Amino acid sequence: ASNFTQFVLVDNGGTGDVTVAPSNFANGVAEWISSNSRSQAYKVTCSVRQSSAQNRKYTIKVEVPKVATQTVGGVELPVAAWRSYLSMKLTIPIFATNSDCELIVKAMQGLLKDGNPIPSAIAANSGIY
Amino acid sequence: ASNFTQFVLVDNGGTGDVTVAPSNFANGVAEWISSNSRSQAYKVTCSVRQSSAQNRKYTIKVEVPKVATQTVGGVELPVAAWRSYLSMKLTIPIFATNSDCELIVKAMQGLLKDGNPIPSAIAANSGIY
Amino acid sequence: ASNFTQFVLVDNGGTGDVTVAPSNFANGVAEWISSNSRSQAYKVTCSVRQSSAQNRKYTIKVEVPKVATQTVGGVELPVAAWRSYLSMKLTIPIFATNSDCELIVKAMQGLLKDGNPIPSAIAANSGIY
Amino acid sequence: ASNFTQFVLVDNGGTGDVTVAPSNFANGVAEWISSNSRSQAYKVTCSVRQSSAQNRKYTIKVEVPKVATQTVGGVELPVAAWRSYLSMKLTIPIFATNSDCELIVKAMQGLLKDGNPIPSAIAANSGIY
Amino acid sequence: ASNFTQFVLVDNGGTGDVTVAPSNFANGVAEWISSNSRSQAYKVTCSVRQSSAQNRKYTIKVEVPKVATQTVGGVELPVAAWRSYLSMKLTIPIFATNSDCELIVKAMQGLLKDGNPIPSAIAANSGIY
Amino acid sequence: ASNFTQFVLVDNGGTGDVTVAPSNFANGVAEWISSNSRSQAYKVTCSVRQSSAQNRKYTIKVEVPKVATQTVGGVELPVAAWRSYLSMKLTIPIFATNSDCELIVKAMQGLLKDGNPIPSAIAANSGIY
RNA sequence: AUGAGGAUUACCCAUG
RNA sequence: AUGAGGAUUACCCAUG
RNA sequence: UGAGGAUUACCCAU
RNA sequence: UGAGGAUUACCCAU
């Protein structure tokens, strides 16, 4: 009926879960932010355009913040100490079938499944070796 | 330890699984590849470097073949019609701790969890609506 | 095999052991980094090149940080109060055989063995006397 | 006491042990030399000075010679076919306590411990891989 | 698990065998040298890059030395009287299957098998006639 | 003698063997070719000349067809997609004796022996790792 | 449009 | 990227 | 090469 | 400071 729904971005098992929701769709860019202060919210944006005459390009961005409380001018303001930025671009030929695309997805899911090299490395501040 | 081992990229539950294994490590850029012709194989590469003075940045690339009507081992042109290209860039501030990084991974896992918008959109040649 | 693996930089028995692992190997420069916040991690880089026509030259570099917590404006970040920098360059003629190198290595080990001058001096904020 | 004494630069058990002893200490530069013909002896020099207002800097230097006999015009002299030159500079902030230095030292010892990368690499005319 | 292992380059049946080992991997160039003095060692290097948009090019080099003992300045130095250089470049289309590549290998093995024209000629300082 | 005879280039053990035979000798450049259309045949050429004043240099070229999905006798374009090109250049100093040359051959044989890195890498569309 | 190019991340740089 | 082009072999030359 | 320097693969002198 | 150099307490670049 619509795919633009809220969804859980960080799953910690019922408690402390980071759920993100639709917040804007201006300029063809779907946005989702966490239920926080715009200054310290999690943000996910997605957009797709037909770049070439034969390709479609999905552009996804995610912002993970480190929440904090800065004291500017002697006043307490909610803020982000720093943000982590994920930026992925997916280019899919138009000849790709639905089944075809499903692979692209599954592949991406596998690439980050627990215990596999890449996420392992990332979660330990190291490279692959 | 050592994290540069083979893993399951596409999980179809036992049968039909696509395993990708290490194939190159020139320039600290790890490369995994499926057991197909380079022309039509699943490719995964990853590397890390300190982009600026405040950040480290993981660069991950994934190549996924179009399989529908594919001709195993054949020569199919144009190349741009039979391959999808994924390109992730993960920027993480030097202040991020191991825990911090685990969260960032979870966020990515969730972004792509089966059933959520982004992946289900890609999986249907759709955008957001 | 590979000699680009993790190893123990600091041996505290089996407790405070400081382990450094591969980071990246771009531009012929191997880099090892300890775990957790890059901001306050140990670093070890190594590289080898043919300096003259008769010599090869190793260039090792080690960084030992002083872990501390920077608090500014009520925002705390894990940082390094300061860092100690080791920088050694080793020149070895091409006429050196494996046997010769072993020797050179043993010399380096001796130079720093517990109880000897240079090491016991450095260890006490002292010089020679 | 004094830490300007003789020590073992190369430990061959109790046989080929290379012992280096005090030579002179002029201009704040300690020098150790092995016995016999200077022309083909081991050399070790060390010195410490206040580089900046916050740092002190050690400068160690080691010379490993390749003993050979030069015969020219029927006249033989004990000389060094060639020499291997080690040159290390260590910078330590003045805020470092004895405890801190011990650490820095242990790091150096580890860096060169048998079996680890850098040492085992140098020992085989090899680099990293 | 890894293909970068030591291997026997010249097989003389257990005795006098010339075995070569990994020695460096800087700049994406795998290197192997014999257990000799860098000045008179056997050397093998390999590297592969994706030259065209549709080709992959393996570049292999081998150095066979004639060991000797030169007397420079009246001193004995280990050295090579001369070196023999092998340089091969292999270009393989990306459409090449694994089975496809296997042929390329077998072909190369056959090309040099004992008793066949080419190696026969080489081993006798003559051309083909 | 006479060494310009047919030989087995690809040995599949009796059946499936690929024999290549002499087909041209213009300009002292010997050419062997398989029994296929020039378009999809195994080709081998070899020649020797004195490159410089100190060296002789064998130039060997090998062309190997892609067979997977090949259509026997058909016209398949583009040519660059169905063929692999090997190009060896062996430089040998004039001082090399027959024995010396035999060794050089052995070195080449070993470089490509079944099971060693280089050949097993090529055989798997892999590089070194 | 490409970039193991960058960020103060729906923007800036370089390139062909 | 090609060269029965070169070497003091991870470099130089010529060419299109 | 520098018992020149640091916010360390980078800056200052021959 | 220099993954600039050596005949190493000294030479070449910012």
PDB file of all heavy atoms in Angstrom, chain B residues 27-47:
ATOM      1  N   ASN B  27      47.856  -3.883  -2.139  1.00  0.00           N
ATOM      2  CA  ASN B  27      47.640  -2.533  -1.613  1.00  0.00           C
ATOM      3  C   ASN B  27      46.758  -2.480  -0.385  1.00  0.00           C
ATOM      4  O   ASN B  27      46.139  -1.453  -0.094  1.00  0.00           O
ATOM      5  CB  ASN B  27      47.050  -1.633  -2.686  1.00  0.00           C
ATOM      6  CG  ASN B  27      48.051  -1.298  -3.757  1.00  0.00           C
ATOM      7  OD1 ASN B  27      49.063  -0.633  -3.486  1.00  0.00           O
ATOM      8  ND2 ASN B  27      47.790  -1.762  -4.987  1.00  0.00           N
ATOM      9  N   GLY B  28      46.712  -3.590   0.341  1.00  0.00           N
ATOM     10  CA  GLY B  28      45.903  -3.650   1.539  1.00  0.00           C
ATOM     11  C   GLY B  28      44.421  -3.673   1.220  1.00  0.00           C
ATOM     12  O   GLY B  28      43.583  -3.553   2.117  1.00  0.00           O
ATOM     13  N   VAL B  29      44.092  -3.819  -0.060  1.00  0.00           N
ATOM     14  CA  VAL B  29      42.701  -3.873  -0.488  1.00  0.00           C
ATOM     15  C   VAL B  29      42.279  -5.330  -0.643  1.00  0.00           C
ATOM     16  O   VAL B  29      42.587  -5.970  -1.647  1.00  0.00           O
ATOM     17  CB  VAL B  29      42.521  -3.152  -1.819  1.00  0.00           C
ATOM     18  CG1 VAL B  29      41.092  -3.266  -2.282  1.00  0.00           C
ATOM     19  CG2 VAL B  29      42.921  -1.710  -1.662  1.00  0.00           C
ATOM     20  N   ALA B  30      41.575  -5.843   0.360  1.00  0.00           N
ATOM     21  CA  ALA B  30      41.120  -7.223   0.359  1.00  0.00           C
ATOM     22  C   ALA B  30      40.049  -7.453  -0.690  1.00  0.00           C
ATOM     23  O   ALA B  30      39.153  -6.629  -0.854  1.00  0.00           O
ATOM     24  CB  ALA B  30      40.591  -7.584   1.721  1.00  0.00           C
ATOM     25  N   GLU B  31      40.135  -8.584  -1.386  1.00  0.00           N
ATOM     26  CA  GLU B  31      39.177  -8.922  -2.429  1.00  0.00           C
ATOM     27  C   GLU B  31      38.671 -10.344  -2.321  1.00  0.00           C
ATOM     28  O   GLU B  31      39.450 -11.280  -2.237  1.00  0.00           O
ATOM     29  CB  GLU B  31      39.814  -8.752  -3.803  1.00  0.00           C
ATOM     30  CG  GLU B  31      38.889  -9.123  -4.957  1.00  0.00           C
ATOM     31  CD  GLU B  31      39.594  -9.159  -6.319  1.00  0.00           C
ATOM     32  OE1 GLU B  31      40.308 -10.149  -6.588  1.00  0.00           O
ATOM     33  OE2 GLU B  31      39.443  -8.199  -7.116  1.00  0.00           O
ATOM     34  N   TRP B  32      37.358 -10.500  -2.316  1.00  0.00           N
ATOM     35  CA  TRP B  32      36.748 -11.819  -2.287  1.00  0.00           C
ATOM     36  C   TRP B  32      36.066 -11.970  -3.640  1.00  0.00           C
ATOM     37  O   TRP B  32      35.580 -10.995  -4.218  1.00  0.00           O
ATOM     38  CB  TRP B  32      35.687 -11.915  -1.212  1.00  0.00           C
ATOM     39  CG  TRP B  32      36.183 -11.901   0.170  1.00  0.00           C
ATOM     40  CD1 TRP B  32      36.338 -12.973   0.990  1.00  0.00           C
ATOM     41  CD2 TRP B  32      36.460 -10.749   0.958  1.00  0.00           C
ATOM     42  NE1 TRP B  32      36.679 -12.561   2.250  1.00  0.00           N
ATOM     43  CE2 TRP B  32      36.762 -11.194   2.258  1.00  0.00           C
ATOM     44  CE3 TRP B  32      36.477  -9.377   0.695  1.00  0.00           C
ATOM     45  CZ2 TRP B  32      37.071 -10.322   3.293  1.00  0.00           C
ATOM     46  CZ3 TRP B  32      36.784  -8.508   1.724  1.00  0.00           C
ATOM     47  CH2 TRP B  32      37.077  -8.985   3.010  1.00  0.00           C
ATOM     48  N   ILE B  33      36.006 -13.193  -4.138  1.00  0.00           N
ATOM     49  CA  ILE B  33      35.386 -13.420  -5.427  1.00  0.00           C
ATOM     50  C   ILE B  33      34.713 -14.787  -5.453  1.00  0.00           C
ATOM     51  O   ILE B  33      35.164 -15.728  -4.790  1.00  0.00           O
ATOM     52  CB  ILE B  33      36.437 -13.361  -6.519  1.00  0.00           C
ATOM     53  CG1 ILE B  33      35.777 -13.169  -7.866  1.00  0.00           C
ATOM     54  CG2 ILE B  33      37.217 -14.662  -6.556  1.00  0.00           C
ATOM     55  CD1 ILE B  33      36.781 -13.217  -8.999  1.00  0.00           C
ATOM     56  N   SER B  34      33.629 -14.892  -6.212  1.00  0.00           N
ATOM     57  CA  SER B  34      32.917 -16.154  -6.321  1.00  0.00           C
ATOM     58  C   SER B  34      33.627 -17.047  -7.325  1.00  0.00           C
ATOM     59  O   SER B  34      34.551 -16.617  -8.009  1.00  0.00           O
ATOM     60  CB  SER B  34      31.482 -15.914  -6.754  1.00  0.00           C
ATOM     61  OG  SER B  34      31.446 -15.077  -7.889  1.00  0.00           O
ATOM     62  N   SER B  35      33.195 -18.295  -7.416  1.00  0.00           N
ATOM     63  CA  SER B  35      33.830 -19.237  -8.318  1.00  0.00           C
ATOM     64  C   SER B  35      33.243 -19.191  -9.721  1.00  0.00           C
ATOM     65  O   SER B  35      32.702 -20.183 -10.207  1.00  0.00           O
ATOM     66  CB  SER B  35      33.712 -20.647  -7.742  1.00  0.00           C
ATOM     67  OG  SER B  35      34.539 -21.554  -8.453  1.00  0.00           O
ATOM     68  N   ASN B  36      33.354 -18.037 -10.367  1.00  0.00           N
ATOM     69  CA  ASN B  36      32.830 -17.844 -11.721  1.00  0.00           C
ATOM     70  C   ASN B  36      33.873 -17.120 -12.544  1.00  0.00           C
ATOM     71  O   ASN B  36      34.973 -16.852 -12.066  1.00  0.00           O
ATOM     72  CB  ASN B  36      31.570 -16.980 -11.694  1.00  0.00           C
ATOM     73  CG  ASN B  36      30.563 -17.456 -10.683  1.00  0.00           C
ATOM     74  OD1 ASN B  36      29.644 -18.205 -11.006  1.00  0.00           O
ATOM     75  ND2 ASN B  36      30.738 -17.035  -9.438  1.00  0.00           N
ATOM     76  N   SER B  37      33.531 -16.799 -13.783  1.00  0.00           N
ATOM     77  CA  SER B  37      34.472 -16.073 -14.615  1.00  0.00           C
ATOM     78  C   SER B  37      34.402 -14.671 -14.064  1.00  0.00           C
ATOM     79  O   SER B  37      33.350 -14.243 -13.600  1.00  0.00           O
ATOM     80  CB  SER B  37      34.042 -16.079 -16.087  1.00  0.00           C
ATOM     81  OG  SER B  37      32.843 -15.349 -16.297  1.00  0.00           O
ATOM     82  N   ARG B  38      35.521 -13.962 -14.083  1.00  0.00           N
ATOM     83  CA  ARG B  38      35.542 -12.599 -13.580  1.00  0.00           C
ATOM     84  C   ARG B  38      34.386 -11.811 -14.171  1.00  0.00           C
ATOM     85  O   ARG B  38      33.757 -11.001 -13.491  1.00  0.00           O
ATOM     86  CB  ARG B  38      36.854 -11.937 -13.962  1.00  0.00           C
ATOM     87  CG  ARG B  38      37.980 -12.270 -13.043  1.00  0.00           C
ATOM     88  CD  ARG B  38      37.936 -11.375 -11.846  1.00  0.00           C
ATOM     89  NE  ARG B  38      38.955 -11.765 -10.887  1.00  0.00           N
ATOM     90  CZ  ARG B  38      39.268 -11.055  -9.814  1.00  0.00           C
ATOM     91  NH1 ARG B  38      38.631  -9.913  -9.572  1.00  0.00           N
ATOM     92  NH2 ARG B  38      40.213 -11.481  -8.988  1.00  0.00           N
ATOM     93  N   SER B  39      34.115 -12.068 -15.446  1.00  0.00           N
ATOM     94  CA  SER B  39      33.051 -11.396 -16.172  1.00  0.00           C
ATOM     95  C   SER B  39      31.693 -11.454 -15.480  1.00  0.00           C
ATOM     96  O   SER B  39      30.938 -10.477 -15.514  1.00  0.00           O
ATOM     97  CB  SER B  39      32.931 -11.996 -17.576  1.00  0.00           C
ATOM     98  OG  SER B  39      31.587 -12.343 -17.889  1.00  0.00           O
ATOM     99  N   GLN B  40      31.385 -12.581 -14.847  1.00  0.00           N
ATOM    100  CA  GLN B  40      30.095 -12.725 -14.192  1.00  0.00           C
ATOM    101  C   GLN B  40      30.127 -13.289 -12.767  1.00  0.00           C
ATOM    102  O   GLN B  40      29.301 -14.135 -12.397  1.00  0.00           O
ATOM    103  CB  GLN B  40      29.200 -13.584 -15.082  1.00  0.00           C
ATOM    104  CG  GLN B  40      29.795 -14.933 -15.425  1.00  0.00           C
ATOM    105  CD  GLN B  40      29.008 -15.668 -16.501  1.00  0.00           C
ATOM    106  OE1 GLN B  40      29.213 -16.866 -16.719  1.00  0.00           O
ATOM    107  NE2 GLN B  40      28.113 -14.953 -17.188  1.00  0.00           N
ATOM    108  N   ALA B  41      31.056 -12.790 -11.957  1.00  0.00           N
ATOM    109  CA  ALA B  41      31.213 -13.253 -10.582  1.00  0.00           C
ATOM    110  C   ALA B  41      30.792 -12.214  -9.566  1.00  0.00           C
ATOM    111  O   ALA B  41      30.653 -11.052  -9.901  1.00  0.00           O
ATOM    112  CB  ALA B  41      32.658 -13.622 -10.337  1.00  0.00           C
ATOM    113  N   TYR B  42      30.573 -12.641  -8.328  1.00  0.00           N
ATOM    114  CA  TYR B  42      30.229 -11.710  -7.271  1.00  0.00           C
ATOM    115  C   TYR B  42      31.580 -11.247  -6.775  1.00  0.00           C
ATOM    116  O   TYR B  42      32.459 -12.065  -6.515  1.00  0.00           O
ATOM    117  CB  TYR B  42      29.515 -12.393  -6.119  1.00  0.00           C
ATOM    118  CG  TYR B  42      28.148 -12.909  -6.450  1.00  0.00           C
ATOM    119  CD1 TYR B  42      27.988 -14.041  -7.231  1.00  0.00           C
ATOM    120  CD2 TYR B  42      27.009 -12.283  -5.954  1.00  0.00           C
ATOM    121  CE1 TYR B  42      26.720 -14.546  -7.508  1.00  0.00           C
ATOM    122  CE2 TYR B  42      25.735 -12.776  -6.227  1.00  0.00           C
ATOM    123  CZ  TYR B  42      25.602 -13.910  -7.004  1.00  0.00           C
ATOM    124  OH  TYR B  42      24.358 -14.428  -7.269  1.00  0.00           O
ATOM    125  N   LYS B  43      31.759  -9.943  -6.659  1.00  0.00           N
ATOM    126  CA  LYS B  43      33.023  -9.427  -6.183  1.00  0.00           C
ATOM    127  C   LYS B  43      32.784  -8.546  -4.964  1.00  0.00           C
ATOM    128  O   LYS B  43      31.781  -7.832  -4.889  1.00  0.00           O
ATOM    129  CB  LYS B  43      33.723  -8.636  -7.292  1.00  0.00           C
ATOM    130  CG  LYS B  43      35.080  -8.100  -6.882  1.00  0.00           C
ATOM    131  CD  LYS B  43      36.005  -7.864  -8.064  1.00  0.00           C
ATOM    132  CE  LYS B  43      35.640  -6.625  -8.860  1.00  0.00           C
ATOM    133  NZ  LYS B  43      36.465  -6.532 -10.111  1.00  0.00           N
ATOM    134  N   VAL B  44      33.693  -8.620  -3.999  1.00  0.00           N
ATOM    135  CA  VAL B  44      33.588  -7.812  -2.798  1.00  0.00           C
ATOM    136  C   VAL B  44      34.982  -7.331  -2.433  1.00  0.00           C
ATOM    137  O   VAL B  44      35.909  -8.131  -2.357  1.00  0.00           O
ATOM    138  CB  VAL B  44      33.012  -8.628  -1.631  1.00  0.00           C
ATOM    139  CG1 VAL B  44      33.004  -7.805  -0.380  1.00  0.00           C
ATOM    140  CG2 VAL B  44      31.611  -9.053  -1.946  1.00  0.00           C
ATOM    141  N   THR B  45      35.141  -6.026  -2.234  1.00  0.00           N
ATOM    142  CA  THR B  45      36.433  -5.466  -1.853  1.00  0.00           C
ATOM    143  C   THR B  45      36.238  -4.496  -0.717  1.00  0.00           C
ATOM    144  O   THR B  45      35.211  -3.831  -0.624  1.00  0.00           O
ATOM    145  CB  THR B  45      37.071  -4.689  -2.963  1.00  0.00           C
ATOM    146  OG1 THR B  45      36.169  -3.666  -3.387  1.00  0.00           O
ATOM    147  CG2 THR B  45      37.397  -5.589  -4.103  1.00  0.00           C
ATOM    148  N   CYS B  46      37.248  -4.387   0.132  1.00  0.00           N
ATOM    149  CA  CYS B  46      37.157  -3.513   1.281  1.00  0.00           C
ATOM    150  C   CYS B  46      38.515  -2.986   1.715  1.00  0.00           C
ATOM    151  O   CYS B  46      39.528  -3.679   1.608  1.00  0.00           O
ATOM    152  CB  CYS B  46      36.501  -4.285   2.416  1.00  0.00           C
ATOM    153  SG  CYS B  46      36.716  -3.552   4.010  1.00  0.00           S
ATOM    154  N   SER B  47      38.533  -1.754   2.210  1.00  0.00           N
ATOM    155  CA  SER B  47      39.774  -1.145   2.657  1.00  0.00           C
ATOM    156  C   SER B  47      39.500  -0.014   3.637  1.00  0.00           C
ATOM    157  O   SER B  47      38.404   0.550   3.658  1.00  0.00           O
ATOM    158  CB  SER B  47      40.533  -0.596   1.465  1.00  0.00           C
ATOM    159  OG  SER B  47      39.850   0.520   0.933  1.00  0.00           O
TER     160      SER B  47
END
